[PDB]
Subunit: 293 residues, 4 copies
């Protein structure tokens, strides 16, 4: 029972035309629907649900909410009961609040971000199928992102004021959503302050992550690639589409994943990383990174 994986992220964009072509031409996503409010829904080729990204028209960048898929409908009532006993108010959005999406349990993380849990989303299948499928589809565009892999949230952190929502988010998703901690970055005196945490429900190194910051916001959303080669191909695609790159291709010590950071036309940061890195396991020791490194 419980959370399976990240379900979708809803992003604020200023230019919908430029944002849609970015996630299509650079990341290889396909648009699956547009609602009557102007929001655009896209999915990756190796995903089988209706969408993993929502672009909403806005006057600014940022994130609206973050959604995670749970195993079955009855998990929503159980998780809801755990969350409110912890002290977080929840509410249940009924099915149809978002198109092609079932009912959703809505609540705010301690850091202030809105998080949703759903059990039901429309099945459309992957672009390769499931009866004698090919390993990859033809006509793939751009980097050919497999799936939306995880999301790193900037969480308000003021050690002098006694505020560390990275720690509070980390406790919340572990005790209420049964995530387990895989890696952490420790700062402060003797590493007594959690500045970055990576947590998992799958056996990939992280499905959610929190990094400290002056205010709560969105650091980036990330997309999975197969190999070190596909990262290089992704860098070539970004060069052809004139994409503003943040960090050049380099292996992250975290996740052991080789990654590229770049932006969409509205300023939201995106990551294409390759490789599993390691098998995340509930009995695996937490990889600790110290501030001096």
């Amino acid at each position: 029972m419980g959370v399976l994986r990240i379900g979708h992220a809803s992003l604020k964009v200023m230019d919908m035309d430029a944002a849609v072509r970015h996630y299509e031409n650079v990341l290889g996503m396909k648009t699956t629907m547009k609602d009557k409010a102007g929001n655009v829904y896209l999915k990756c080729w190796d995903e089988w649900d209706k969408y993993s990204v929502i672009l909403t028209p806005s006057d600014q960048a940022g994130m609206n909410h973050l959604a995670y898929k749970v195993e079955k409908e009855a998990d929503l009532e159980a998780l809801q009961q755990k969350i409110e006993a912890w002290g977080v108010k929840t509410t249940m959005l009924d099915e149809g609040t978002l198109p092609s999406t079932g009912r959703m349990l809505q609540f705010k993380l301690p850091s202030g971000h809105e998080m949703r849990l759903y059990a039901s989303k429309e099945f459309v299948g992957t672009d390769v199928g499931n009866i004698n499928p090919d390993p990859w589809p033809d006509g793939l565009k751009g980097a050919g992102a497999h799936w939306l892999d995880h999301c790193l949230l900037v969480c308000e952190m003021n050690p002098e004021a006694g505020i560390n929502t990275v720690a509070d988010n980390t406790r919340f998703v572990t005790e209420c959503l049964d995530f387990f901690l895989t890696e952490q970055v420790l700062v402060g005196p003797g590493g007594s302050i959690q500045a970055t945490t990576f947590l998992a429900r799958t056996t990939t190194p992280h499905d959610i992550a929190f990094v400290g910051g002056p205010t709560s916001g969105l650091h980036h959303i990330a997309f999975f690639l197969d190999s070190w080669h596909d990262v290089l191909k992704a860098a070539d695609v970004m060069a052809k589409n004139k994409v503003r790159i943040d960090v050049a291709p380099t292996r992250h010590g975290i996740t052991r994943g080789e990654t590229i950071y770049f932006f969409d036309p509205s300023g939201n940061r995106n990551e294409t990383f390759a490789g599993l890195g390691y098998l995340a396991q509930r009995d695996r020791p937490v990889t600790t990174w110290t501030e001096d490194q």
Copy 2:
């Protein structure tokens, strides 16, 4: 709760000297202990428990048993209760039956293979550590296998006699051990016969697998590699060590993984495969392969 991943495989070897150097020089494992009965225990560099492979002296090849690690000790009593309600007799080996290994729940699969579940094995840590670790260790030998990934068992199957232990094993590990089916190979009229099944507890495509055969036995044990390049490097290592190769480097339609099949000096088949392939998910449709392919 429940099974985490494959824990170890115990293999019968005829020449212990030749078998130990094979798993050390070809696969990159390290020997961690030898018991007073002559059995040798080895682990991979990216594993943190004491051992994942047991070599036992014998007059023949084959497998002794297969072991899977569970989340906590109390899971053994719960799984034991489910297994016997299904109709499989179990027994509890106490801690110390194997060195550095806690108590084990022992039972036979419908196909006749002996399977064990343990919760506790001695921690020794990975070869890269967990405080600011490197992505890979220096002095790595051979293919540098990350971890024992899965095991494919040959399961007795006689469709005319009404015997299909691939199906019975598949039902057993799903209903009793809460595995979920990720891929299958269907044969017979209209694909009405399961000849091969792949099942998972992690989010890797398969942690156990069953293939039909005239008699029940061991098809191969498999080891994980990072990338397509490490497979090539593995093929070069096998050429330097004069290893009997079964299948040349080629991508498997199953798992989407690029793999090599080869043998140890006693005849047991080994696999080095690279890549996650896809994220196995309980809501993902089962990849079906038909006999005509």
Copy 3:
């Protein structure tokens, strides 16, 4: 002065429709012209001349001739003079004998194969251009072969009858065409018989190659790929197009290149190999392979 590289190979095909779609869909070549005799001319994307492959309709497979490009027109008279002093009759085909192709010096190798040298072929440029070009073109099909790299000829060899055209071809192309030997396979007593030779004009390991055989013929023509990954992608393409594979993906000890062998619909063998392997140099010792290996 002298030979630059392999220029084109003319192959006999039985089904022109099936052969053209093979070299287009599998190897990624593009058809550039068809003459009034039904012959089809194709080039690779990273080539700048008009064509590197000629498909001629025929009732059998095999090779018509092999063509190499020389640095300047005046090299043809000089090479012609060296060849006839060696004892090989030559003839000069005038410009236009083949469409878009200048005059050609024609002669037969000692093994009996027809070889041609030209200095002038129509320029059409590569598919990426030469003013701020991209590293690779979009819409690339199949394996995306960079260029026709080399050709391995089966050369009549009968050691008991005193016939070894592999040796005679090797002496001919070295003394007359200033090729240099990079690798060889030695067989017979103490390696006193050259069974396979690889020779170069470029600094790639081989631009022509000869292997012994009962009769003189065509072993394969080969196409260059960038990396180990592109070989895997090539294997996936051949699986999608139902291509008859000869040898699975494996690294060749020769050339150090990772390669795949496969056939076109008429039976001619093709090779897609990746990597430079090493820098061929006139002062580099000849890599010798012995029969026992």
Copy 4:
């Protein structure tokens, strides 16, 4: 006849201990001799001559001279005659001026750099051999650089003062040493000024290169790696050895090669790049890069 490839580069280092361990541990070179003046000579594993790098103790960084190997001894007299007819004074250092090195033709490029040509250097062979060799050697250290590939020189350039030694060097090595231009970077009005040139004798994209600068000096020396993966491995090695990186792993539009720039302990810049990129050919159009890009 003529130049084969870059032969060696002589660098000034301030800390010989720190410099030698850098080229050994990071680049994988091996020290082959030390002369009585304190100079240290190193070679790469896939080279067969005595050394490709000379470290000389000094109070500053920079380059002493650059050396290229020619095909035969008699080429030195012929090249010497061409060079002085062009207007460059030459001198002949006799054999033994450098240990294990034959006689050398010495002269200064128009940019002021000292260049040497030799025909004879002591043979020691590659680390894999030449009788049934392995594709790569065991116990390889660091990035495992195959060979010193090329050298980029900063050449004094003052367009207002009428000084452009990039152009003068480019004319010199083409007309006197029979190099051919493969790529160029054009700046100024309408691209009427050569700011960077790449030239070849091999069929690799460049064996020497010149970039404009206020003063003449050394930009970097470069080492060849096989694949995109070996570049990643190189970045991991530099991280383990605490190497000052200049440019993160990224594909260069020039050469199409994926590269890393970094420094030795004395400040000299080094490059590890992978891949052939394209086959350099005397009939290939010069790849032109414009200033706006």
